[PDB]
Amino acid sequence: MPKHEFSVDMTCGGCAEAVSRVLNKLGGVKYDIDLPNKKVCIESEHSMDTLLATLKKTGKTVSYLGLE
Numbered sequence: 001m002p003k004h005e006f007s008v009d010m011t012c013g014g015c016a017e018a019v020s021r022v023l024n025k026l027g028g029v030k031y032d033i034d035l036p037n038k039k040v041c042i043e044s045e046h047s048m049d050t051l052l053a054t055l056k057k058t059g060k061t062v063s064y065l066g067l068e
């Protein structure tokens, strides 16, 4: 199953919480948040568009670091 890696402008724990809330409301996702490195790793059959649009709902700078 595709593992997408994203960069999110998370400055503290409450940003990581904001990230989980939006990703939870999305559903169909297993996810991993690395706060010190400002990274979010997402196991999902969801398209990159959807994941990107979802993460951007937080109001924060989001970019795509790619896949594996």
Ligand SMILES: [Ag+]
Residues within 6 Å of the ligand: 010, 011, 012, 013, 014, 015, 016
């Ligand atoms: Ag924060």
Ligand SMILES: [Ag+]
Residues within 6 Å of the ligand: 012, 013, 014, 015, 016, 018
């Ligand atoms: Ag915050």
